[PDB]
Structure 1
């Protein structure tokens, strides 16, 4: 019942990124230091590459939670610019007004 399949895929990526998150943190800790032996670091590199693709946190995009717009989205309200302006003009957003100075 999401807005579109693109939003549905993004939700799945977020869910699969929330999972395996600690495992990525633990493996990447091995990879991001020079104290550990290089052979162990390379094995950690192989393990983190073998991890599922969707678990990568950089595949998550902050889309609008109302129109699934991939860009023009304010992160504080998680709304696209058009939806944000529509609510602000109607007055349904507290403490938000036209800026004149």
Structure 2
């Protein structure tokens, strides 16, 4: 997660297979959920704050 390696936003894939999610908050490329643009961590951090609209804690 180096500024330098956030060339992901560059579109210019030369070929669209070189495209890759990346966290829209920490750059955590490794486990980024689509529906949020966030990585498994941030998703959890924000869900705790309440900044994830209608994203309550599951249980059953």
TM-score normalised to structure 2 length: 0.86
Q: What do you get for the CA RMSD once the two structures are aligned?
A: 1.3
Pick the structure with greater CA Rg: 1
Q: Name which of 6, 9, 15 aligns with 1:11.
A: 9
Which stretches in structure 1 are left out of the alignment for 5+ residues?
Answer: 17-53
**Which segments of structure 1 move beyond 2 Å, counting only runs of 4 or more?**
none
Q: Which has the higher helix share?
A: 1
Give the deviation of 1:61 after TM superposition: 0.6
Counterparts in 2 of 1:35-50, with a 5 A limit? none
